[PDB]
Every structure is written in C-alpha cells, then in structure tokens.
Design an enzyme around this catalytic site. Structure first.
Site, PDB file in Angstrom:
ATOM      1  N   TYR B  49       0.849  -1.243   0.000  1.00  0.00           N
ATOM      2  CA  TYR B  49       0.000   0.000   0.000  1.00  0.00           C
ATOM      3  C   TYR B  49       0.847   1.240   0.000  1.00  0.00           C
ATOM      4  CZ  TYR B  49      -5.058  -0.091  -0.341  1.00  0.00           C
ATOM      5  OH  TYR B  49      -6.313  -0.227  -0.867  1.00  0.00           O
ATOM      6  N   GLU B  51      -0.541   4.729  -0.728  1.00  0.00           N
ATOM      7  CA  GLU B  51      -1.303   5.956  -0.822  1.00  0.00           C
ATOM      8  C   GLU B  51      -0.391   7.139  -0.592  1.00  0.00           C
ATOM      9  OE1 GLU B  51      -4.226   5.695   2.091  1.00  0.00           O
ATOM     10  OE2 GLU B  51      -5.776   4.887   0.830  1.00  0.00           O
ATOM     11  N   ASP B 195      -4.503  14.044 -25.463  1.00  0.00           N
ATOM     12  CA  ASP B 195      -4.498  12.635 -25.056  1.00  0.00           C
ATOM     13  C   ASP B 195      -3.781  11.897 -26.164  1.00  0.00           C
ATOM     14  OD1 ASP B 195      -5.028  10.040 -24.506  1.00  0.00           O
ATOM     15  OD2 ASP B 195      -7.249  10.157 -24.457  1.00  0.00           O
ATOM     16  N   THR B 221      -2.006   6.483 -22.278  1.00  0.00           N
ATOM     17  CA  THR B 221      -1.781   5.154 -21.791  1.00  0.00           C
ATOM     18  C   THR B 221      -0.317   4.817 -21.896  1.00  0.00           C
ATOM     19  OG1 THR B 221      -2.196   4.318 -24.023  1.00  0.00           O
ATOM     20  CG2 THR B 221      -3.979   4.381 -22.417  1.00  0.00           C
ATOM     21  N   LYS B 224      -0.096   0.328 -25.580  1.00  0.00           N
ATOM     22  CA  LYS B 224      -0.190   0.857 -26.957  1.00  0.00           C
ATOM     23  C   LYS B 224       1.171   1.069 -27.609  1.00  0.00           C
ATOM     24  CE  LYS B 224      -4.333   3.435 -26.070  1.00  0.00           C
ATOM     25  NZ  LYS B 224      -5.424   2.460 -26.108  1.00  0.00           N
TER      26      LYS B 224
HETATM   27  C1  LIG Z   1      -7.051   8.064 -26.973  1.00  0.00           C
HETATM   28  C2  LIG Z   1      -7.418   7.116 -25.898  1.00  0.00           C
HETATM   29  N1  LIG Z   1      -7.441   7.595 -24.677  1.00  0.00           N
HETATM   30  C3  LIG Z   1      -7.750   6.800 -23.664  1.00  0.00           C
HETATM   31  C4  LIG Z   1      -8.062   5.457 -23.828  1.00  0.00           C
HETATM   32  C5  LIG Z   1      -8.479   4.650 -22.616  1.00  0.00           C
HETATM   33  O1  LIG Z   1      -7.492   3.970 -21.849  1.00  0.00           O
HETATM   34  P1  LIG Z   1      -7.940   2.736 -20.935  1.00  0.00           P
HETATM   35  O2  LIG Z   1      -8.627   1.801 -21.860  1.00  0.00           O
HETATM   36  O3  LIG Z   1      -6.638   2.183 -20.353  1.00  0.00           O
HETATM   37  O4  LIG Z   1      -8.915   3.347 -19.867  1.00  0.00           O
HETATM   38  C6  LIG Z   1      -8.009   4.933 -25.098  1.00  0.00           C
HETATM   39  C7  LIG Z   1      -8.411   3.528 -25.392  1.00  0.00           C
HETATM   40  N2  LIG Z   1      -8.693   3.203 -26.603  1.00  0.00           N
HETATM   41  C8  LIG Z   1      -9.178   1.879 -26.943  1.00  0.00           C
HETATM   42  C9  LIG Z   1      -8.764   1.571 -28.327  1.00  0.00           C
HETATM   43  O5  LIG Z   1      -8.225   2.434 -28.989  1.00  0.00           O
HETATM   44  O6  LIG Z   1      -9.022   0.472 -28.756  1.00  0.00           O
HETATM   45  C10 LIG Z   1      -7.698   5.791 -26.157  1.00  0.00           C
HETATM   46  O7  LIG Z   1      -7.682   5.288 -27.441  1.00  0.00           O
HETATM   47  C1  LIG Z   2     -12.987   0.126   3.025  1.00  0.00           C
HETATM   48  C2  LIG Z   2     -12.150   0.510   1.872  1.00  0.00           C
HETATM   49  N1  LIG Z   2     -12.738   0.758   0.702  1.00  0.00           N
HETATM   50  C3  LIG Z   2     -11.983   1.093  -0.347  1.00  0.00           C
HETATM   51  C4  LIG Z   2     -10.603   1.197  -0.271  1.00  0.00           C
HETATM   52  C5  LIG Z   2      -9.833   1.635  -1.524  1.00  0.00           C
HETATM   53  O1  LIG Z   2      -9.228   0.617  -2.273  1.00  0.00           O
HETATM   54  P1  LIG Z   2      -8.145   1.063  -3.345  1.00  0.00           P
HETATM   55  O2  LIG Z   2      -6.993   1.629  -2.541  1.00  0.00           O
HETATM   56  O3  LIG Z   2      -7.987  -0.281  -4.024  1.00  0.00           O
HETATM   57  O4  LIG Z   2      -8.773   2.148  -4.156  1.00  0.00           O
HETATM   58  C6  LIG Z   2      -9.978   0.879   0.950  1.00  0.00           C
HETATM   59  C7  LIG Z   2      -8.519   1.056   1.169  1.00  0.00           C
HETATM   60  N2  LIG Z   2      -8.166   1.292   2.382  1.00  0.00           N
HETATM   61  C8  LIG Z   2      -6.789   1.549   2.720  1.00  0.00           C
HETATM   62  C9  LIG Z   2      -6.484   1.113   4.116  1.00  0.00           C
HETATM   63  O5  LIG Z   2      -7.347   0.973   4.985  1.00  0.00           O
HETATM   64  O6  LIG Z   2      -5.314   0.944   4.371  1.00  0.00           O
HETATM   65  C10 LIG Z   2     -10.785   0.559   2.034  1.00  0.00           C
HETATM   66  O7  LIG Z   2     -10.257   0.252   3.250  1.00  0.00           O
END
Ligand SMILES: Cc1ncc(COP(=O)(O)O)c(CNCC(=O)O)c1O
Ligand SMILES: Cc1ncc(COP(=O)(O)O)c(CNCC(=O)O)c1O
Lengths: 410, 410
Positions: B49, B51, B195, B221, B224
């Site tokens: 973790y 954060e 982007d 991303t 890609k």
């Molecule tokens: C320009 C652009 N921006 C953002 C994303 C989104 O990223 P994530 O999927 O990791 O959320 C994509 C995905 N494009 C899908 C494709 O071109 O097939 C994209 O083409």
């Molecule tokens: C109850 C709860 N819900 C959601 C999250 C968020 O998960 P992601 O970090 O995967 O976004 C946490 C993380 N909690 C951190 C901790 O207690 O240490 C959590 O405890």
C-alpha cells in the site's frame, strides 16, 4: 538478461522483496499473496484489449479472455453467494465510484461512516470525488462504547433522508450487523451499499457475517483479507442493478480492463474457496485477538472498543508517546511496519493522530500463530516504552530478525 | 507447482498464449510487451500500500516503493521532455478524469474530437463520465479531405468558448498539429489537453511531433505504441497544475496505486529511452504505410484520409462486405484480429460500422517488416473478397501459420 539492462530498477525490486521478508508487516490492509496470484498478473494477458463483457466485447480475439473473466465472475458468485458479480474494477475506489454512479445522482444525500471512526475516503471525504460529487453526511460510533449504535443511526437517517447508506470500514474492529443496516435503509427508503474491503476474506472464511443478502450492492477490494491481487469487485442479487453497475464500470468509469489482474482474481478466488481458507481465517482472528490482549492488559494502553472480532484493532498510544506518527516511526526503527491512525473522536491533528492500527493478515499468511503474535505485541509495547533507549531498540530489532528468519515470506 | 491446483485457469492462460502466438494482431491499440515488463507486474510489489506520493506517503516502509515510483516519474520526464509527471493513474480513462477534475468544473464546456471521427469515449460520449459531467461539444474532420481543419475548428471554438479543448484520437491516421491546437485554445482562453495514448510511442521515437510543449496537460496510456503495461500517465510543465493533478489522482479519484504496474512502467520507459526504440518507431510507420498502400490501390477499398503518417489507418469495406463487423468476423476466421470501426460521418449502426481499423505495432514488435506487412494486407483483401468460400480461407489460414511460426511471439 533483463535485470542487466536495468539494474537501478531491478535492484529496487529485489530490495523490496527483502524488506518484506525482514519486516513484520502489521498494516491491516496488506497481505502476502500466493506465487500463483503474482504469476497470473505477470502473464501476457496484459497485451489483450477487452472492452465490454464476456460474450459482448468490442474486439475480436477475446474468446479465451472470456473464459478467464468468466471464471472470475463465477468464482465470486460462488464464493460470496451472489447472483451477479463484476470483476473489472481497477481498485476499491473505482468499484465504489461505479456503484454511486449506478444508484444515485450527483448532489444526492448519502450517509457514510465518519473518516475518524473508520470510514474510507470514498465514503465522503471532501478531498474525494465522493464528497465532491454527493452530499455526504457522516455517522459515527457511540462516544462511550465506541460501537455502532443502530438506534442513533436510525434517528439520524430519519432526519437526513439519504438516498443511499454506505456501511463498512477501514478501522472498525467489531462485528457489523448488516441486517440492522438494511432495516435502517428500508425504514427511510434508502439503498444500502456495503464496502467490505477489509473484511471480505473473513466473510469468505465464515468468520464475518455476509453483507451480501442484505446490501443492494456489496463492493470490496480483491486485496486485503481476501488475499487477492490489487483491484476491486462488485456484487449484487438484483438483475437490474447489475445492468446499471456493468454500464457504470464500463463505459461509464473505465476503459479496457486489466485481464491479467482479472486472471489473478480468478486465482485468488479459487484459493479462497479451498477449505484451507477457513483455517487461515480462524488464524487471522486468533492472531489479532492475541496481539490485542497484550495492549488490553497493559495499563498504559487502550484498545478501541476494548478488543476486536476481526483482523484489526486500534490502540491509543498517547500515554506512552506523543502521537501515532511517533509510534509508527519507533516501530519502524525495529522493523515492525504499521500505520498511525485516527481513533474515534480524534482530538489531535490528522497528520499526527492518537492511535496505531494493527492487523494480523500478513503475519498469519507467513504462518505465524498465537504465540508469535503475542510476542510481537510485547515487542511493540517494549519499543514504545523504551523509544529513547537505542540499546533496547537495537536488541528488539535483532529478536525480530530471528522471527522473520524463522517464518520466511515465500 | 500451483498450476496443478487450478488447471482451468492456467489451461486458459496457455490457450491465450497460443492464441496470441497463432494470430496476426492488428488491433491498433494492442502491442506485445517485453518479458521484463511482465516480470515487473508479477512481483510482490503488489503486496504494498502506498497511498500518497514519493516522500509524502500515508504508510510506513515505503522507501523502496518511492525509489521505484521516482524512477518511473523521472524516466517519463526525461523521455517526454516534461517537468512533471504522475505515474499512478490506473488507466488511460482514469488519467483523463484526473485532468478534467484539475482544470475545469462540472458543467463547464469542452471541445473534443467526435467519436465517429476517432475521439475516445472519455472525450465526451454521453455514456462516459466525461459527457455526463461536462458539456462536451465535438469537432469533426473535413467531410472531403477527412482531415482536421484548423480554420474550421478555430471558428467553432470562437462560437463555443470552451474552457478546455481536448485533442488526440483513437482512430486518426494523420499528424495532429499541436501547435495549432494551442494557438486555437489561446485564442479563446481555453486549456489544451492532448491525449496521446495511441501515438505516445511514436512521440517517444521521434516519428510524431510531441504535444508536450504545446499542451498544458498531456495524457496517455502506457500500453499501446509505448509498449508498456496497462496504465495511465500524465505530464505537464506547469507546477501549479501538477499539484492539482496529483491531488486529483489521489485522493481525488483513486486510492492505493498499483506499484507493481508502476515498476513495469519504469521498465517500459527505460526501454523506450533505448536508441533501438527509434528503429522500432521507424518500422511501425513503414509497416503501416505498406499495409495501407495495398488498400489504396485496390479499387474496392478506400482508406480514410487517403493513407497514413502513423501506426494505423481505417478502411471502408462496404463495397466488398456489408459492414465492419462482418469484416472482423471473417478475418478472425483466418487468424487475423482487428476491430470494426466507425469512419468519419459513419452512416451505419455503430454496432455494424463501415470500416476496419488496422495497426502495425504488434506485428512490428514481433520482428515483421514491409514484405510481411504487405503480404498481410494482401491476405486481408483476398479473405474479404472470398468470404463465403471456406476452402480459400482454409488456405489463407495455413499461409498465416507459416508466417506466425516464422516470427514467434517471445
Ligand atoms: C485516446 C485514448 N485515450 C484513452 C483510452 C483509454 O485507456 P484505458 O482503456 O486504459 O482506460 C483509449 C483507449 N482506446 C481503446 C482503443 O483504442 O481500442 C484511447 O484510445
Ligand atoms: C474500506 C475501503 N474501501 C476502499 C478502499 C480503496 O481501495 P483502493 O486503494 O484499491 O482504491 C480501501 C482502502 N483502504 C486503505 C487502508 O485501509 O489501508 C478501504 O479500506
């Protein structure tokens, strides 16, 4: 060969592996996953785009991915007894965002547990999208008992009239009554969402009651007690909510899913279906209780709510050191890592806090039992009471190496 | 031997590895990552973790994670020529959400490229958080030239007065002029966000000019053309913006970052800083131009905009088959994977579309060159013309196999 191309990076990776081995990790939200879980994430599934759901993707070449993602969905449903699951969320935060987007609208009123009493950022912190987008009103624990008071919460819900009540915590040690939470929801016509991130492994192992039959929607991290990869999961028994949740996760909130991580979720879920996972749970519970007993019995420390019935607890350290940041630092000097933590009705700065939070899952996964757990807690006590005696700290650190050597990480 | 514990899951992973091996992957957003990228994601960094940000984390024992995250950040900065980077976003989608949260407010007006002309869901689709929270108003390409008309776009901006203009696309084959988009933004007081997810690798190699000096904020991303793990990344040269970007990513939108993925990001970015990466850029351009050349010249196929200067292009197939969707099913039958795709001013259902999107980065990453690219295009043309003649497909399938064997996946 590849470690030779990039030594700065692989040096750091090997260093973290050794640091995990040489530290007693009590951060309550960490665990130690299986080699299988890590190996699933290290596969070439990372090369596949798979927008959409099994059977309805936006790309060809997804028939195998479908088998994988479908394994994961079916294993969650089976493990948690839910009629629907979505395994695409990237994190617990993302899972939670998806649920809000599915059940309420911006500006709607939502009740959530207070940050200080154990609520998560995504349960209405003003610095989170949760607090920014919705009107969150917080409920607390009772000031004397430090327990949820289900009548007070009902009384407040009757005044506040929320569209959604969120239950679940990051730092509550006692068994939550989900049937009461749903009763409360029902009485004011609110949805109930349960975020079982912390306790999901214990729900799976049979040591915490399930929110699944009582929440409209249950979210969780796949990491933490469930000992999965880092990611999120959503569950429900309502077919209509499930369509909304699927649309909320994608294309509402995310793009392509992490199918390698999803593979790893499938792995973890099957591990949790194995009968041995009941043993792990029982041990998580005993180990946490053993650690807490040491602080209960010590006069200079107080455990919040007087103990625990799950994998974690909080201790007020302020009679022995100034605040929780200080305690976090001192324990770190002896290779015990945890986190400082607000206690209910916290009087000190959020950056300081009055408390520490301790969990058993990581040490339980390394194979430690009650006596080691008890010993650890004694060493924490000893380190805080002698925080200004370098010679004691030096000695504790060496005792801890004996223990870490004796329960190797992997 | 944990594969013995879960043979459904692991057989499926093997199946997908053979699917990927026996398949010509032309989905333009896919690539093939190095063993080192996969290995970093398969580490025990998943247990940790973190954060917060390097040096200012919420939990203890993060000194090694901080080295790893700082490498990713420092490498992104060196590589892209930016003063600030954030490497925590879980995806391209999360990265873009964070920029919006940082630069504009709900309800503010935004111009982004129209979905049919190759803008992304997160550039304003009404089913995305983007169009649900912000007033997205799309610009298009010229109806004739199918190019971006910077005069048209300037005039539209002058009517619309957006707070933000978003540039970048998932399906435009030509150089985007980022200097012009910034002079356009400047003329109406708008932020410019680019982007560059699709072209990041080419920007990295020198084969596409960079948005970084022109955009207030750049997103991408890491998967890609940059040939990295699935993930997001955000760049800026403005310090005050960086602070906001960081607050937006966490605690704004996310919780704990995926530090194993971030290790992998660091890996991929050092790969892209290697002079061999420019040769890969070069071949990506050439292989795409060669596959495109085949369709131009074929009389039953038009290539959108007439050709390409990047890793991809679109092709209208309606002469030879009913729609893009059908094209995609056919080509999959000969182990060629791509995706259906709307063409500018698409007439047909978006479930059908008039086109196919084709990309060169995956095949270029397997070692293929201009002759194989050209041959692959021939095979596509041939299979579409012979789409109901199974004895022909069967033959193409067999010739494809010779080529896949000849350029093995790892
Ligand atoms: C320009 C652009 N921006 C953002 C994303 C989104 O990223 P994530 O999927 O990791 O959320 C994509 C995905 N494009 C899908 C494709 O071109 O097939 C994209 O083409
Ligand atoms: C109850 C709860 N819900 C959601 C999250 C968020 O998960 P992601 O970090 O995967 O976004 C946490 C993380 N909690 C951190 C901790 O207690 O240490 C959590 O405890």
């Amino acid at each position: 060969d590849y470690k030779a191309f990039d030594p700065e990076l692989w040096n750091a990776i090997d260093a973290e592996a050794e640091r995990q081995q040489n530290n007693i990790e009590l951060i309550a939200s960490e665990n130690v996953v299986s080699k299988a879980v890590m190996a699933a994430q290290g596969t070439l599934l990372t090369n596949k785009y798979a927008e959409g759901y099994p059977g309805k993707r936006y790309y060809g070449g997804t028939a195998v991915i479908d088998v994988v993602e479908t394994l994961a969905i079916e294993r969650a449903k089976k493990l948690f007894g839910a009629k629907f699951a979505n395994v695409q969320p990237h994190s617990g935060s993302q899972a939670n965002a998806a649920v809000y987007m599915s059940l309420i609208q911006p500006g709607d009123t939502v009740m959530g547990m207070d940050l200080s009493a154990g609520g998560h950022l995504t349960h209405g912190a003003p610095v989170s999208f949760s607090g920014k987008t919705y009107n969150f009103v917080s409920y607390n624990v009772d000031k004397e008992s430090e327990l949820l008071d289900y009548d007070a919460i009902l009384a407040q819900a009757k005044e506040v009239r929320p569209k959604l009540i969120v239950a679940g915590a990051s730092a509550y040690s006692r068994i939550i009554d989900f049937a009461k939470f749903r009763e409360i929801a029902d009485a004011v016509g609110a949805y109930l969402m349960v975020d079982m991130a912390h306790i999901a492994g214990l729900v799976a192992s049979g040591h915490h009651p399930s929110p699944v039959p009582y929440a409209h929607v249950t979210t969780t991290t796949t990491h933490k007690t469930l000992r999965g990869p880092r990611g999120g999961l959503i569950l429900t028994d309502d077919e209509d909510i499930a369509k909304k949740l699927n649309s909320a996760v994608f294309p509402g909130l995310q793009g392509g899913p992490l199918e390698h991580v999803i593979a790893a979720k499938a792995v973890a879920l099957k591990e949790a279906l194995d009968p041995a996972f009941k043993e792990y749970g029982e041990n998580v519970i005993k180990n946490a209780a053993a650690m807490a007993d040491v602080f209960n019995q010590h006069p200079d420390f107080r455990v919040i709510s007087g103990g625990t019935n799950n994998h974690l607890f909080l201790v007020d350290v302020t009679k022995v050191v100034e605040n929780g940041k200080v305690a976090q630092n001192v324990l770190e000097e002896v290779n015990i890592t945890l986190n400082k933590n607000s206690i209910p009705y916290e009087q000190l700065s959020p950056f300081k806090t009055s408390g520490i939070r301790v969990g058993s899952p990581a040490i339980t996964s390394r194979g430690m039992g009650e006596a080691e757990s008890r010993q650890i807690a004694e060493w924490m006590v000893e380190a805080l009471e002698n925080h200004d005696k370098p010679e004691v700290l030096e000695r504790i650190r060496g005792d801890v190496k004996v223990l870490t050597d004796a329960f190797p990480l992997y």
